[PDB]
Amino acid sequence: MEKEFEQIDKSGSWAAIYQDIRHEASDFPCRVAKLPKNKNRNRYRDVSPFDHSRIKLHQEDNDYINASLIKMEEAQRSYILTQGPLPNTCGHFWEMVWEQKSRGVVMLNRVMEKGSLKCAQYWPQKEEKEMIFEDTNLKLTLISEDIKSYYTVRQLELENLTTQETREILHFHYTTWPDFGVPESPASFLNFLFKVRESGSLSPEHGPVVVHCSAGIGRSGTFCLADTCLLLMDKRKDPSSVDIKKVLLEMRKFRMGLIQTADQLRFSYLAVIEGAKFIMGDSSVQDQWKELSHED
Ligand SMILES: CN1CCOc2cc(S(=O)(=O)N[C@@H](Cc3ccc([C@@H]4CC(=O)NS4(=O)=O)cc3)c3nc4ccccc4[nH]3)ccc21
Numbered sequence: 001m002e003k004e005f006e007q008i009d010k011s012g013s014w015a016a017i018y019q020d021i022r023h024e025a026s027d028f029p030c031r032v033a034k035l036p037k038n039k040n041r042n043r044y045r046d047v048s049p050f051d052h053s054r055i056k057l058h059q060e061d062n063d064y065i066n067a068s069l070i071k072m073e074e075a076q077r078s079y080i081l082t083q084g085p086l087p088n089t090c091g092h093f094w095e096m097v098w099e100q101k102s103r104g105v106v107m108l109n110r111v112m113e114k115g116s117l118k119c120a121q122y123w124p125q126k127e128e129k130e131m132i133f134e135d136t137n138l139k140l141t142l143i144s145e146d147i148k149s150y151y152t153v154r155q156l157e158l159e160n161l162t163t164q165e166t167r168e169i170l171h172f173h174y175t176t177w178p179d180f181g182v183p184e185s186p187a188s189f190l191n192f193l194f195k196v197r198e199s200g201s202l203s204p205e206h207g208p209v210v211v212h213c214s215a216g217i218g219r220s221g222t223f224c225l226a227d228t229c230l231l232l233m234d235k236r237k238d239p240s241s242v243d244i245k246k247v248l249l250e251m252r253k254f255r256m257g258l259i260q261t262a263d264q265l266r267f268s269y270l271a272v273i274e275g276a277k278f279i280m281g282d283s284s285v286q287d288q289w290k291e292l293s294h295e296d
């Protein structure tokens with residue numbers, strides 16, 4: 001993988017490699033997403049979930065949400081990638097989390113970036129001001145939060161008002177990942193990814209983790225690609241056989257446009273090459289990543 005990395009860097013062909021992936025990516029219909037009645041349920045007109053992999057809400061009225069199930073068979077992990085909830089789809093968002101039995105939510109964007117809203121404030125910012133989603137009959141409360149320099153982890157209590165049942169949801173919010181950009185370093189990214197892994201949120205005993213950014217494809221795709229490749233390197237007899245370009249094409253069978261720039265693709269290689277050191281037994285990199293990330 002790093003041999004390929006070196007060659008691409010030397011040739012300066014990242015844009016070409018990336019364009020080839022865009023050209024070869026699957027193109028499946030998004031008929032439901034495009035129905036007139038779903039116009040206000042989509043944040044961006046050019047980012048829709050494929051019908052075959054879309055997550056269906058459990059309701060007779062309208063079961064649509066701009067979200068896709070990415071099921072990576074070999075890696076044995078599923079992720080739900082979705083757009084940043086809109087003011088009218090926050091209830092749908094949490095209904096999906098409840099129905100799919102998700103334990104964690106990974107947010108890679110900020111509500112406002114460079115003066116523009118990119119996502120609705122779908123969770124409570126104050127413990128004393130909980131939220132009620134009347135359309136889906138759910139209540140959400142901020143229990144606590146651990147604020148680090150570039151990411152915050154929150155403990156949320158989600159309650160199904162119909163049954164009084166409650167569940168703890170972990171919110172992993174990466175706050176310094178610019179739009180169409182990359183994390184400050186492979187170290188800061190990996191430190192965060194392993195925080196999510198360590199929480200148990202990605203365990204197969206839970207429903208798929210919900211990952212989102214603004215459109216749910218650029219930053220969200222980078223996060224999932226790196227995680228899946230690391231999973232495969234740890235599982236295969238020979239980790240050097242992991243073809244990140246092939247893994248990305250496989251993921252794009254489930255949702256369009258995953259990885260939005262050639263540099264996010266290059267960053268994925270770097271994150272996986274760096275992350276591989278831990279997978280192969282290096283006991284000092286995890287700690288090194290934390291120091292490098294300056295999370296305190
Ligand atoms: C072609 N063209 C020129 C540029 O501006 C737009 C914006 C939209 S639009 O209706 O505002 N649609 C947006 C969709 C969109 C929005 C945000 C992102 C973010 C990129 C990232 O790193 N993470 S993400 O939150 O997925 C990815 C994709 C979108 N589509 C684009 C196509 C080319 C370049 C930038 C784009 N942003 C549609 C077309 C165009």
Ligand SMILES: [Ca+2]
Nearest residue numbers: 125126127128
């Ligand atoms: Ca207070």
